[PDB]
Design a protein around this nucleic acid. Structure first.
Ligand code: MG
Ligand code: MG
Length: 861
RNA sequence: CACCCGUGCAAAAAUGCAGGGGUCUAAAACUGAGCGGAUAACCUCUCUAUGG
RNA sequence: CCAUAGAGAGGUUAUCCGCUCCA
């Protein structure tokens, strides 16, 4: 929407007395355009300008650019920020007024410019996007313990890298009671049958078989994840504050375990590439007679794994099926080998366009870049496809007639020896030459969904690209880039970016272990709610009897083998079994308002499909009628009678989707408050250095927002009222406003230290939705996930504060929370006060409508 | 539809207009041609399992 | 033999995140 950004004005920096401007270069690169010194402009980039200045004024610059459509826009002078209607030109400061402190921390001294602060804030944001995912992985691992009752377990909380497994093993005969339980929890964790759900991190493939890793390696993985969560959320004093940025000093055991876990896919991709694609390689070698097979395998590797020339500027898939349309290859005979035939045809087209038809590819991309309507694009594709078919008909037929029958088997067993030294110089780098930060990121991604795997890496790509662009900009201007010894990790930001993009080239979701079907069957029974009178030591025997494991399902066993054949292998069940406690997600599925409201986010196509598969007329009554089908699903104990069974068998996928969506987005909601508390700790640490008496944050979490606001606690409560002088003497720019200072003070006067402490503990340990089955029991309506999550956490707080002394404000809040079966809109802003020093974050995390980026709504005062 | 900042005009403190903000929040960037990952329907084959 | 379910292969249509090239 910003016409200034549309016209190409990437940034407006301000260093010293001058002001520099930049434009959008190639991708995320920034290129200087011109500099301003007191309404006098000296242009830069004379060779290829991006925009020109029409009139330059003290309070703004007018530009016109030709990025897309010629649009004229106006920018504002950075030196004039906070210098309007009441020394008129100075470098702007941040909202928190921590710019000098952050600069003196990251770099060796103060800087009289606002370029370094943006890089520092990007570095800070790197930690923000890691705490959300790191505490999410810890949620899954801690939840894999399958605790049935109320669970407050904390295993990874105490884990630290400073001690190795040799010292940890010394706690077996230790005379301290706490260390006994510390070791017993680890023993129970490694003895768990559900570690097979993360076989890529907990299992090693050594006919051979994949077995559980050694205890030392399991402990190292667990300690690494726990310490990453600890460092991401908390802010430790001393050298522990720079653990992620000085992972070089990790112990030998942790280094070796990181190397081993990272080497698992790379060895599977490089060392057995020929063995995995032998049939295709041999067929292509027979086709391309004149080429060298050593170069052919390298080209195939570039086409499949690296995929660096694949961005040819046109859709090879669409080209291939415009070429093959209307021919004999659409028959039902070739679907058994389509997966190889189509890919080999794509490789043939890609090689042709790379080598001999590069000019034709350039002409095609030029024509496509100026295309008007959809009719033109398909016509150009049809013409190119006609040429490609007339050129490659014989080769395609030769491939197709040698891709069936005994020939596939013969080429699948025949040995092929190939000089591979050419392929080595293109193989993706092993763990030997890959940095510990990226290896740790890879290890972390083993414990979360594939969608979050992509999101976590890509955000890191963007952040490191921004860091690199900022660093490059300050080298052109002659500024200082050299970080202090604490943060020297960022000097190699280019190589970290390269390693991260290389990792993203091949990263996939977590992989199960083939010997993990009995546990998944039991888990599916628990999730669907099928119960048996048999004990724990007999249900396993019954599962072994039915499976007789490579499955051998007996005849006419009914739901017993129906589940084993149709619900263990489902992708939805794979997603849900590693996320959410199986014996708990059934009870929360009984919340009719919760399932009814979550069904609104489900696509109107999925809803129609599953309504047509259960009932035999508006969408609202459709959703309502299928919501109670999801809620009260039932089965047997372990015409219409079979019909009501088939209905519940059909509703299984929608049930699993509903549960997974609810749990995932509730954890996403909790991630915001995890980030907020991390920020509170970090900013307390920063303000402590700047010269502000912040007190002890651990005792009272509102100490930051009290010291910044200027108030203090005496006799347990604040004895200071509103006075306009306090607003203007605030430590940061957020609280300089009188009305919001007053509102934050008012909400702060009705909070409790213990309540805020437990809010912090519940947000960090994720207990609010770990005991979701208890805290969701009585809800009248659900309006959004903000409301649902806050109801859950308020119910948890009331449940624990049942017998402890609670003062008038919290008592009134709990009374409201019990009278109305919905979250109390005042309790949230009462216990959200530790974020008051950051007013925008505080308002985002208190009133809904402002909470969600994708769901804007009206804000009430 | 949040917060802050610039300018213009009523006005004694804020409103109305029009803009900017990687240095505000999970939150800087318009269009076309594509690439990778993930999800959700529909069509056609193959392999399943439940039922009449 | 028909109904339903779930997987694998190939396409089609939305959607989100990131990246390359051009204007
Ligand atoms: Mg904690
Ligand atoms: Mg930012």
């Amino acid at each position: 929407k910003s016409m200034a950004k549309a016209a190409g004005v990437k940034s407006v920096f301000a260093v010293g007395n001058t002001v520099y401007m930049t434009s959008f270069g190639r991708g995320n690169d920034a290129v200087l355009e011109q500099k301003i010194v007191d309404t006098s402009h000296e242009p830069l980039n004379i060779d290829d300008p991006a925009y020109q200045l029409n009139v330059v004024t003290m309070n703004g610059y007018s530009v016109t650019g030709h990025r897309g459509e010629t649009v004229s826009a106006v920018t504002d002078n950075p030196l004039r920020r906070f210098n309007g209607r009441k020394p008129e030109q100075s470098v702007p400061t941040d909202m928190l007024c921590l710019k000098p402190t952050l600069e003196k921390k990251f770099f060796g001294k103060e800087f009289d410019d606002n370029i370094h602060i943006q890089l520092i804030y990007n570095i800070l944001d790197i930690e923000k996007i890691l705490a959300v995912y790191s505490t999410n992985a810890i949620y899954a691992l801690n939840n894999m313990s399958a605790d049935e009752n109320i669970e407050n377990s904390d295993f990874f909380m105490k884990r630290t890298t400073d001690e190795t497994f040799d010292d940890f093993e010394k706690k077996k005969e230790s005379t301290n009671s706490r260390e006994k339980a510390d070791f017993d929890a680890f023993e129970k964790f490694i003895g768990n049958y559900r570690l097979a759900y993360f076989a890529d991190a907990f299992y090693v493939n050594k006919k051979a078989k994949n077995v559980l890793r050694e205890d030392k390696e399991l402990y190292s993985v667990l300690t690494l994840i726990g310490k990453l969560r600890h460092w991401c959320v908390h802010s430790e004093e001393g050298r522990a504050e720079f653990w992620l940025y000085k992972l070089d000093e990790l112990k030998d055991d942790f280094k070796n375990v990181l190397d081993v876990v990272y080497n698992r896919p790379v060895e599977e991709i490089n060392n057995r590439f020929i063995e995995n694609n032998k049939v295709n390689i041999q067929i292509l070698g027979s086709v391309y007679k004149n080429t060298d097979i050593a170069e052919l395998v390298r080209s195939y590797y570039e086409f499949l794994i690296t995929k660096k020339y694949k961005n040819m500027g046109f859709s090879i898939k669409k080209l291939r099926e415009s070429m093959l349309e209307g021919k004999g290859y659409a028959d039902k005979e070739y679907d058994s080998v389509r997966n190889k035939l189509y890919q080999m045809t794509d490789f043939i087209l890609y090689t042709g366009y790379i080598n001999e038809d590069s000019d034709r590819a350039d002409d095609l991309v030029n024509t496509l870049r100026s295309s008007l309507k959809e009719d033109d694009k398909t016509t150009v594709y049809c013409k190119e496809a006609d040429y490609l078919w007339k050129k490659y008909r014989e080769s395609i037929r030769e491939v197709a007639d040698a891709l069936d029958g005994d020939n596939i088997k013969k080429l699948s067993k025949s040995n092929i020896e190939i000089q591979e030294d050419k392929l080595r110089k293109c193989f993706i780098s092993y763990a030997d030459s890959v940095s510990e930060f990226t290896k740790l990121i890879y290890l972390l991604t083993r414990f979360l969904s594939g969608k979050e795997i992509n999101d976590l890496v890509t955000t890191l790509i963007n952040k490191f690209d921004n860091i690199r662009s900022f660093l490059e900009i300050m080298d052109e201007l002659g500024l200082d880039r050299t970080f202090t010894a604490e943060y020297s990790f960022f000097e190699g930001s280019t190589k970290y970016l390269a390693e991260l993009v290389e990792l993203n080239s091949f990263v996939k979701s977590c992989s199960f272990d083939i010997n993990a079907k009995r546990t998944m069957y039991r888990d599916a029974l628990d999730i669907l709610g099928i119960e048996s009178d048999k004990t724990e030591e007999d249900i396993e025997k019954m599962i072994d009897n039915i499976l007789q494991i490579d499955k051998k399902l007996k005849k006419n066993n009914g739901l017993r083998n129906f589940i084993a054949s149709n619900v263990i292998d489902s992708n939805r069940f794979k997603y849900l079994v590693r996320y959410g406690n199986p014996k708990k997600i059934r009870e929360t599925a009984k919340c009719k308002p919760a399932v009814r409201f979550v069904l609104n986010e489900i696509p109107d196509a999925q809803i129609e499909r599953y309504y047509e598969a259960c009932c035999p007329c508006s969408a609202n009554k459709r959703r309502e009628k299928l919501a109670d089908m999801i809620a009260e699903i039932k089965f047997e104990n372990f015409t219409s009678e079979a019909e009501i069974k088939r209905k519940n068998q059909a509703i299984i996928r929608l049930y699993l989707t509903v549960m997974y969506i609810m749990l995932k987005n509730l954890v996403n909601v909790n991630a915001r408050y995890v980030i907020a508390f991390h920020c509170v700790e970090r900013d307390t640490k920063l303000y402590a250095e700047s010269g502000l008496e912040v007190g002890n944050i651990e005792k009272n979490k509102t100490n930051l927002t009290m010291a910044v606001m200027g108030v203090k606690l005496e006799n347990g409560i604040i004895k200071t009222e509103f006075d306009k002088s306090f607003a203007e003497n605030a430590a940061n720019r957020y609280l300089r406003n009188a009305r919001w200072y007053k509102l934050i003070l008012d909400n702060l006067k009705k909070s409790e230290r213990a309540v805020v402490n437990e809010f912090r503990n519940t947000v960090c340990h994720l207990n609010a939705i770990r005991n979701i089955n208890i805290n969701i029991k009585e809800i009248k309506e659900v309006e959004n996930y903000f409301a649902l999550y806050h109801y859950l956490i308020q119910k948890h707080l009331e449940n624990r504060f049942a017998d402890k002394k609670v003062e008038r404000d919290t008592g009134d809040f709990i009374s409201k929370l019990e009278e109305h079966k919905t979250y109390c809109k005042d309790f949230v802003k009462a216990y959200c006060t530790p974020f008051g020093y950051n007013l925008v974050r505080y308002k985002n995390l208190t009133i809904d409508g402002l909470f969600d980026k994708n769901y804007p709504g009206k804000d009430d005062s």
